């Protein structure tokens, strides 16, 4: 009835788009990375560190907490 | 290293700029004030997460709650 339920399920195809553009491209660069749990900090700041030193947005931010959560991810069943 | 972090940037400002709009419409809807935010903010992620959750929802939520916050802050 109220907005509160509309707006979520409208964010459930937002989050759901996200989801399905980029899980599969997030795997790739960590195929590329193969990181470990030994410099997955290491990779992971850097990779902040150059992602940030060209302008930052909320898209950049959730992209990188989208990033950081697949390489945890990554490394606790790759590693 | 390099690449990864110029990828992102690429990824983050398409979603910047796929959704901005999306999330500044449904602020229209909800009129949010600094005195119901939490309610507002609360029953949302209530209704995203009744179908399941995946990270790519929980980003959204989180991009919308700092929409939603930075508009409670200026009024």
Same mark, same amino acid.
Do not use: C
């Given at each position: 009835?109220?907005?509160?339920?509309?707006?979520?399920?409208?964010?459930?195809?937002?989050?759901?788009?996200?989801?399905?553009?980029?899980? =599969?491209? %997030?795997?790739?660069?960590?195929?590329?990375?193969?990181?470990? +749990?030994?410099?997955?900090?290491? @990779?992971?700041?850097?990779?902040?560190? =150059?992602? %940030?030193?060209?302008?930052?947005?909320?898209?950049?931010?959730? +992209?990188?907490?989208?990033?950081? @959560?697949?390489?945890?991810?990554?490394?606790?069943?790759?590693?």
């Amino acid at each position: 009835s109220s907005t509160m339920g509309q707006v979520g399920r409208q964010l459930a195809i937002i989050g759901d788009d996200i989801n399905r553009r980029y899980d =599969s491209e %997030f795997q790739t660069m960590l195929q590329h990375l193969q990181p470990t +749990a030994e410099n997955a900090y290491e @990779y992971f700041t850097k990779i902040a560190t =150059s992602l %940030f030193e060209s302008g930052i947005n909320w898209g950049r931010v959730v +992209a990188l907490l989208g990033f950081g @959560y697949r390489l945890a991810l990554h490394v606790y069943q790759h590693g």
